[PDB]
Design an enzyme around this catalytic site. Structure first.
Site, PDB file in Angstrom:
ATOM      1  N   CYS A 174       0.738  -1.128   0.140  1.00 47.07           N
ATOM      2  CA  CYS A 174      -0.070   0.089   0.019  1.00 47.07           C
ATOM      3  C   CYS A 174       0.973   1.340   0.006  1.00 47.07           C
ATOM      4  O   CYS A 174       1.573   1.355   0.936  1.00 47.07           O
ATOM      5  CB  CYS A 174      -0.809   0.089   1.329  1.00 47.07           C
ATOM      6  SG  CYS A 174      -1.946   1.297   1.275  1.00 47.07           S
ATOM      7  N   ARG A 212       0.195   4.336   3.152  1.00 45.88           N
ATOM      8  CA  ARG A 212       0.222   4.390   4.565  1.00 45.88           C
ATOM      9  C   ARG A 212       0.762   5.378   5.261  1.00 45.88           C
ATOM     10  O   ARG A 212       0.644   5.310   6.569  1.00 45.88           O
ATOM     11  CB  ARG A 212       1.163   3.052   4.825  1.00 45.88           C
ATOM     12  CG  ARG A 212       0.639   1.505   4.233  1.00 45.88           C
ATOM     13  CD  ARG A 212       1.755   0.403   4.581  1.00 45.88           C
ATOM     14  NE  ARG A 212       2.736   0.314   3.504  1.00 45.88           N
ATOM     15  CZ  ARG A 212       3.965  -0.340   3.523  1.00 45.88           C
ATOM     16  NH1 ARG A 212       4.240  -0.787   4.710  1.00 45.88           N
ATOM     17  NH2 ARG A 212       4.521  -0.348   2.355  1.00 45.88           N
ATOM     18  N   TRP A 215      -8.713   6.293  -0.378  1.00 42.54           N
ATOM     19  CA  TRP A 215      -9.138   6.920  -1.593  1.00 42.54           C
ATOM     20  C   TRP A 215      -8.334   6.672  -2.638  1.00 42.54           C
ATOM     21  O   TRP A 215      -7.268   6.081  -2.458  1.00 42.54           O
ATOM     22  CB  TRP A 215      -9.166   8.608  -1.045  1.00 42.54           C
ATOM     23  CG  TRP A 215      -7.997   9.202  -0.842  1.00 42.54           C
ATOM     24  CD1 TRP A 215      -6.736   9.305  -1.494  1.00 42.54           C
ATOM     25  CD2 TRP A 215      -7.398   9.384   0.679  1.00 42.54           C
ATOM     26  NE1 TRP A 215      -5.425   9.630  -0.506  1.00 42.54           N
ATOM     27  CE2 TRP A 215      -6.069   9.889   0.738  1.00 42.54           C
ATOM     28  CE3 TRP A 215      -8.390   9.272   1.881  1.00 42.54           C
ATOM     29  CZ2 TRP A 215      -5.586  10.263   1.906  1.00 42.54           C
ATOM     30  CZ3 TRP A 215      -7.608   9.762   3.278  1.00 42.54           C
ATOM     31  CH2 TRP A 215      -6.472  10.368   3.115  1.00 42.54           C
ATOM     32  N   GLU A 225      -4.739   4.261 -10.686  1.00 43.27           N
ATOM     33  CA  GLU A 225      -5.470   2.919 -10.364  1.00 43.27           C
ATOM     34  C   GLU A 225      -6.622   2.900 -11.480  1.00 43.27           C
ATOM     35  O   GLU A 225      -6.949   2.058 -12.037  1.00 43.27           O
ATOM     36  CB  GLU A 225      -6.157   2.934  -9.083  1.00 43.27           C
ATOM     37  CG  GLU A 225      -4.994   2.643  -7.641  1.00 43.27           C
ATOM     38  CD  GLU A 225      -5.714   2.675  -6.537  1.00 43.27           C
ATOM     39  OE1 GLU A 225      -6.177   1.516  -5.976  1.00 43.27           O
ATOM     40  OE2 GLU A 225      -5.601   3.716  -5.632  1.00 43.27           O
TER      41      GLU A 225
HETATM   42  C1  HEM Z   1      -5.721   6.696   2.138  1.00 43.11           C
HETATM   43  C2  HEM Z   1      -5.535   6.383   0.881  1.00 43.11           C
HETATM   44  C3  HEM Z   1      -4.915   5.310   0.240  1.00 43.11           C
HETATM   45  C4  HEM Z   1      -4.325   5.079  -1.031  1.00 43.11           C
HETATM   46  C5  HEM Z   1      -4.006   6.319  -1.971  1.00 43.11           C
HETATM   47  C6  HEM Z   1      -3.947   3.593  -1.105  1.00 43.11           C
HETATM   48  C7  HEM Z   1      -3.143   3.110  -2.110  1.00 43.11           C
HETATM   49  C8  HEM Z   1      -2.717   1.983  -2.442  1.00 43.11           C
HETATM   50  C9  HEM Z   1      -2.535   1.534  -3.775  1.00 43.11           C
HETATM   51  C10 HEM Z   1      -2.242   2.119  -4.855  1.00 43.11           C
HETATM   52  C11 HEM Z   1      -2.526   0.182  -3.434  1.00 43.11           C
HETATM   53  C12 HEM Z   1      -2.262  -1.157  -4.725  1.00 43.11           C
HETATM   54  C13 HEM Z   1      -3.788  -1.187  -4.988  1.00 43.11           C
HETATM   55  C14 HEM Z   1      -4.032  -1.732  -6.650  1.00 43.11           C
HETATM   56  O1  HEM Z   1      -3.045  -1.499  -7.383  1.00 43.11           O
HETATM   57  O2  HEM Z   1      -4.921  -2.643  -6.695  1.00 43.11           O
HETATM   58  C15 HEM Z   1      -2.667  -0.286  -2.242  1.00 43.11           C
HETATM   59  C16 HEM Z   1      -2.884  -1.759  -1.868  1.00 43.11           C
HETATM   60  C17 HEM Z   1      -3.278  -1.769  -0.484  1.00 43.11           C
HETATM   61  N1  HEM Z   1      -3.569  -0.900   0.361  1.00 43.11           N
HETATM   62 FE1  HEM Z   1      -3.929   0.865   0.255  1.00 43.11          FE
HETATM   63  N2  HEM Z   1      -4.252   2.914   0.136  1.00 43.11           N
HETATM   64  C18 HEM Z   1      -4.889   3.826   0.865  1.00 43.11           C
HETATM   65  C19 HEM Z   1      -5.550   3.361   1.918  1.00 43.11           C
HETATM   66  C20 HEM Z   1      -5.788   2.127   2.475  1.00 43.11           C
HETATM   67  C21 HEM Z   1      -6.343   1.714   3.845  1.00 43.11           C
HETATM   68  C22 HEM Z   1      -7.492   2.491   4.771  1.00 43.11           C
HETATM   69  C23 HEM Z   1      -6.140   0.335   3.936  1.00 43.11           C
HETATM   70  C24 HEM Z   1      -6.486  -0.795   5.081  1.00 43.11           C
HETATM   71  C25 HEM Z   1      -6.701  -0.281   6.288  1.00 43.11           C
HETATM   72  C26 HEM Z   1      -5.275   0.030   2.721  1.00 43.11           C
HETATM   73  C27 HEM Z   1      -4.427  -1.352   2.774  1.00 43.11           C
HETATM   74  C28 HEM Z   1      -4.180  -1.696   1.563  1.00 43.11           C
HETATM   75  C29 HEM Z   1      -3.850  -2.940   1.078  1.00 43.11           C
HETATM   76  C30 HEM Z   1      -3.727  -4.213   2.169  1.00 43.11           C
HETATM   77  C31 HEM Z   1      -3.147  -3.126  -0.035  1.00 43.11           C
HETATM   78  C32 HEM Z   1      -2.997  -4.139  -0.760  1.00 43.11           C
HETATM   79  C33 HEM Z   1      -4.167  -4.865  -1.418  1.00 43.11           C
HETATM   80  C34 HEM Z   1      -3.924  -5.924  -2.478  1.00 43.11           C
HETATM   81  O3  HEM Z   1      -2.942  -6.818  -2.375  1.00 43.11           O
HETATM   82  O4  HEM Z   1      -4.875  -6.314  -3.534  1.00 43.11           O
HETATM   83  N3  HEM Z   1      -4.944   0.951   2.070  1.00 43.11           N
HETATM   84  N4  HEM Z   1      -3.011   0.879  -1.449  1.00 43.11           N
HETATM   85  N1  LIG Z   2      -6.892   3.120  -3.137  1.00 43.91           N
HETATM   86  C1  LIG Z   2      -7.460   1.886  -2.721  1.00 43.91           C
HETATM   87  C2  LIG Z   2      -7.775   1.838  -1.274  1.00 43.91           C
HETATM   88  S1  LIG Z   2      -6.534   0.469  -0.816  1.00 43.91           S
HETATM   89  N2  LIG Z   2      -7.665   1.012  -3.627  1.00 43.91           N
HETATM   90  C3  LIG Z   2      -7.283   0.068  -3.931  1.00 43.91           C
HETATM   91  C4  LIG Z   2      -8.010  -1.158  -4.623  1.00 43.91           C
HETATM   92  C5  LIG Z   2      -8.634  -0.621  -5.789  1.00 43.91           C
HETATM   93  C6  LIG Z   2      -8.329  -1.014  -7.379  1.00 43.91           C
HETATM   94  N3  LIG Z   2      -6.995  -0.658  -7.459  1.00 43.91           N
HETATM   95  C7  LIG Z   2      -9.167   0.038  -8.229  1.00 43.91           C
HETATM   96  O1  LIG Z   2      -8.479   0.562  -8.927  1.00 43.91           O
HETATM   97  O2  LIG Z   2     -10.419  -0.138  -8.130  1.00 43.91           O
END
Ligand code: HEM
Ligand SMILES: N=C(CS)NCCC[C@H](N)C(=O)O
Ligand code: HEM
Ligand SMILES: C[C@H](O)[C@H](O)[C@H]1CNc2nc(N)[nH]c(=O)c2N1
Ligand SMILES: C[C@H](O)[C@H](O)[C@H]1CNc2nc(N)[nH]c(=O)c2N1
Ligand SMILES: N=C(CS)NCCC[C@H](N)C(=O)O
Ligand SMILES: [Zn+2]
Lengths: 411, 407
Positions: free
Chosen positions: B106, B109, B278, B283
């Protein structure tokens, strides 16, 4: 054991057994992945095994495994090792070796070409002037008036570690970097330290933004010597854009021949510390990294200024827009002057084909995703979507310390 | 084997000591890197609980305290006697924030400590789950000014009584495979869409049909529910320069809310734990719209821009991509819906990495996932070495419920 890799765009699944021949280590453990870390004398003892292993592969490649010719070869290498403590590769074994080192290079997206390598045997070479001569012929053969051909030149192998052949340049052709007193840099910041040494060794620096560096050549453990590549052998291409006529006024050019000169080639446990090699450029090497890395020529700002982009906020994507134009311009200039180049879509598509082929015919293909995925538009290339397994096979190309770090000056 | 990471753009070097706490395995060995593979009893529970409480009490500086030992004591009795235990609210909140803190994939973070946790462990039915979900959606969306949140359903017991949200995200568009073999709507959702349809749903069969929620309480058969449309904030996509852009008829939703992961805290498993933050712009504008297996709109965009599509070396795909992504960012910004661009997010992540190295001795990070899918090397994360390892509390993947459900 058999390992699956899936491509998430097409669902194609591939099966890897080749990794079972991996000997060297990755730098990873069960608990930590180092997949993004840039860099994670040999006696009689380890030497015969390493030789035997290489020769078994070699004889297999040629369908002669276990043949008399095979048995006698093992025998003779063995006797040579115990007697002289090292051994000499035959020409056929060297060619095969250099070819596999390319084939096994997991960070190389250009490997579909591996079998077409032109290998120049420079093992009879004894002096730096002899090195300069070999390298000249390599530049001229590979450049081939813009219709580039892959080549490698192999200098004598290591013996005791005190008589090393080295090419002190990181690539045979590269531009000088100069640190100015006001803290700015003239030319390529990547080559500042190497430039300084060249200057210190006696090089008269023209001090411009694109000065081809002199060759700094070390034979037989002796102090290295300077030589200037004949400018008529250095093919360069002025950078212009098919629509932006002010683009030429930026003053950009690049050389056509990328020729990595600082790696070590290991074949059958033998170490070739000077083994310059060359292919041709993928456009993003120049247009993305050389031109737009902040620590390289860094032209994004000046290109963007000229495009009159909204530079007041990143979320205008002004940076991304300039980057595309610069890469268009690089590919257009090369194609126009009929110099070989491959764009990142074409190269990565070829790579997936090569990789599938290698899985079918060889049992796999070690591939470093971090390096294989291009530095722009990653996910719109098919490699982004391809799972890869990374592991170390020999023959191989290895990093080695910069020689100015380890060399003992005759003075 | 205390480890250094180097930024090659800046030469900042950071020492990693946090990895020596790693527990779980990476998938890698000394002989193989698997860094790019997408998915690489009473006796077990007490050590798991201990390891978590030890960090909790350490975090609030009562390590070794009576209250620490008493808690360890208490949980231990409850396992002995009940074969599981219950998290205190405080421990639950800490555990959730830390599972996000540890998510090495993520990039977002920097925000980890501001998570709003909604405790739904008193939920018992799919209707109750729907109610919790709408409250989450509405709270997080916050009229465009998005706020991080997770909603935590009751934990696993015997695996025959799991709570699961069958959707992969709370809010996603349907996919239908056509009479002529193509796909209308989102091809990634074609199968889930089928399960909804073959579960009762009446698909409008359009290009952007918000999917119904398919919710599963206490191991029962899951149930359909429509999200109140007025809680689904959507953005019509226009370009700030190309008036024809809006005729493309593209929109996307404001709330990314991953709903199919499993939250492990102190050995307890929360198989329904939807969380939302958000969007980073790419994405939607890179993956959702341009992946070949998703809305795949590159050719139609490049066509409307009259680009030379005869040869790949015109970089027409690349040119189209930049424009699409400018339009995503522009739309969200114009409608005041929270969105972050890839430059700004990766710079934050570098700063966050800095903070974590200084304050925690490291930050697990998966370069393959953290580098944006466009303009990689002009973002600072491209030049940053990352060490990837698994800390707990964590979010884990889990099989899709339909493969598992006994109807
Ligand atoms: C606040 C804005 C946030 C942004 C901009 C963000 C950004 C991202 C991005 C770009 C990815 C890769 C997503 C993809 O390519 O499918 C990701 C993955 C992830 N984020 Fe976030 N994130 C946010 C909030 C959160 C929150 C609130 C959580 C959980 C409490 C979280 C946990 C994760 C996890 C577990 C992944 C990996 C999910 C997977 O393997 O499919 N993130 N995040
Ligand atoms: N930023 C977030 C919250 S972790 N999104 C993650 C997964 C959404 C997916 N990549 C999409 O483009 O719909
Ligand atoms: C024929 C055209 C070729 C293309 C398009 C090509 C493409 C590339 C590219 C793009 C890289 C990454 C370079 C970087 O980003 O710095 C690379 C790495 C590499 N290639 Fe090639 N390559 C070619 C030929 C060769 C040849 C002839 C050899 C050796 C005989 C070779 C061996 C390697 C090695 C060892 C690396 C890893 C470099 C490193 O670790 O720094 N390639 N290749
Ligand atoms: C830290 C990181 O591993 C480093 O930037 C790597 C990433 N991928 C790369 N990929 C290529 N082709 N060339 C490079 O120099 C790099 N650099
Ligand atoms: C094969 C490869 O692991 C896969 O394409 C990954 C690469 N990096 C990614 N990065 C992000 N942020 N999201 C993704 O889905 C992926 N997919
Ligand atoms: N394609 C090749 C032959 S492997 N080049 C390798 C390295 C060149 C370097 N990236 C540069 O941009 O000058
Ligand atoms: Zn690894």
């Amino acid at each position: 054991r058999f390992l699956k890799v899936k491509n998430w765009e097409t669902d194609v699944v591939l099966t890897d057994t080749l990794h079972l021949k991996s000997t060297l280590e990755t730098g990873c453990t069960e608990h930590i992945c180092m997949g993004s870390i840039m860099l994670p004398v040999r006696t009689k003892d380890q030497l015969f095994p390493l030789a035997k292993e290489f020769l078994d592969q070699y004889y297999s490649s040629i369908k002669r495994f276990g043949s008399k010719a095979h048995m006698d070869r093992l025998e003779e290498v063995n006797k040579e090792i115990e007697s002289t403590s090292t051994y000499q590769l035959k020409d056929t074994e060297l060619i095969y070796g250099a070819k596999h080192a390319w084939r096994n290079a997991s960070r190389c997206v250009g490997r579909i070409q591996w079998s077409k390598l032109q290998v120049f045997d420079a093992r009879d070479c004894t002096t730096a002037h002899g090195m300069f001569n070999y390298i000249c012929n390599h530049v001229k053969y590979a450049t081939n008036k813009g219709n580039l051909r892959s080549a490698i030149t192999i200098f004598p192998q290591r013996t005791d570690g005190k008589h090393d052949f080295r090419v002190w340049n990181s690539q045979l052709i590269r531009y000088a970097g100069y640190k100015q007193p006001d803290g700015s840099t003239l030319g390529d910041p990547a080559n500042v330290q190497f430039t300084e040494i060249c200057i210190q060794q006696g090089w008269k620096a023209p001090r411009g933004r694109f000065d081809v560096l002199p060759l700094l050549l070390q034979a037989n453990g002796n102090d290295p010597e300077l030589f200037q590549i004949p400018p008529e052998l250095v093919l360069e291409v002025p950078i212009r854009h098919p629509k932006f006529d002010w683009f030429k006024d930026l003053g950009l050019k690049w050389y056509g021949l990328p020729a990595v000169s600082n790696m070590l080639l290991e074949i059958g446990g033998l170490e070739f510390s000077a083994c310059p090699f060359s292919g041709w450029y993928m456009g993003t090497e120049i247009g993305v990294r050389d031109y737009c890395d902040n620590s390289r020529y860094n032209i994004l700002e000046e290109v963007a200024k000229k495009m009159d982009l909204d530079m007041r906020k990143t979320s205008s994507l002004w940076k991304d827009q300039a980057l595309v134009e610069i890469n268009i311009a690089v590919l257009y200039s090369f194609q126009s002057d009929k110099v070989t180049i491959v764009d990142h879509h074409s190269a990565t598509e070829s790579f997936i084909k090569h990789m599938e082929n290698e899985y079918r015919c060889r049992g796999g293909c070690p591939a470093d995703w971090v390096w294989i995925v291009p530095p722009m538009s990653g996910s719109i290339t098919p490699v982004f979507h391809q799972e890869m397994l990374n592991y170390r096979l020999t023959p191989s190309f290895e990093y080695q310390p910069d020689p100015w770090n380890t060399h003992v000056w005759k003075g």
